[PDB]
Amino acid sequence: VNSFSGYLKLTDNVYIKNADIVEEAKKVKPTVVVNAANVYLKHGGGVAGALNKATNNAMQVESDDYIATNGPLKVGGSCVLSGHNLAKHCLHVVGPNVNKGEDIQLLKSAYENFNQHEVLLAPLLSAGIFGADPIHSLRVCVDTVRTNVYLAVFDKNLYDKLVSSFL
Numbered sequence: 242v243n244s245f246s247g248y249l250k251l252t253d254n255v256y257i258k259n260a261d262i263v264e265e266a267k268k269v270k271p272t273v274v275v276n277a278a279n280v281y282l283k284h285g286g287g288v289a290g291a292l293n294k295a296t297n298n299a300m301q302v303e304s305d306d307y308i309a310t311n312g313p314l315k316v317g318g319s320c321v322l323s324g325h326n327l328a329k330h331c332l333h334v335v336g337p338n339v340n341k342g343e344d345i346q347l348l349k350s351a352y353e354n355f356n357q358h359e360v361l362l363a364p365l366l367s368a369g370i371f372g373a374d375p376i377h378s379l380r381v382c383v384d385t386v387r388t389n390v391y392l393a394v395f396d397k398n399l400y401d402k403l404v405s406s407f408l
């Protein structure tokens with residue numbers, strides 16, 4: 242039993258809710274929140290911009306130190322950093338950005354990072370400003386993640402479409 246509330250169950254291990262991941266993280270304080278990161282951990286907009294703003298830029302400060310030490314992530318890769326005031330940990334995961342020309346096949350690799358964590362609060366990878374089809378992102382999520390994932394979908398119209406078209 243965990244603290245997530247109001248989610249629709251899609252599968253044994255995948256759940257979905259129309260919610261702002263920032264407000265959801267602040268309420269649940271999950272062990273792991275997933276950030277829709279880029280390889281440079283520059284949290285300028287989208288989910289990443291929103292999560293970083295909610296940390297009063299502490300996420301960005303920590304991220305800049307991480308990059309100065311380790312260099313950029315790989316597309317499809319991830320790193321674990323602090324969750325600051327939002328969660329115990331933040332799993333920064335780099336889904337491919339279609340608006341940069343990156344291979345959509347890397348989306349499965351991106352979701353594989355979730356399997357290293359028993360329970361996660363997460364957005365749909367590569368959706369929104371990363372330019373992929375969210376219906377597809379959801380299919381890959383369900384077919385790749387085996388741990389317990391709670392998806393927060395910001396847009397109500399998108400959420401209703403995701404549920405009504407789910408196979």
Ligand SMILES: O=C(O)C[C@H](NC(=O)c1ncnc2[nH]ccc12)c1ccc(O)cc1
Nearest residue numbers: 261262287288291368369393394395396399
């Ligand atoms: O629809 C989606 O969920 C994908 C994408 N989502 C986010 O960027 C997002 N997801 C969850 N929590 C969040 N908090 C702040 C941003 C945010 C999106 C959003 C709006 C839109 O019109 C089209 C796609």
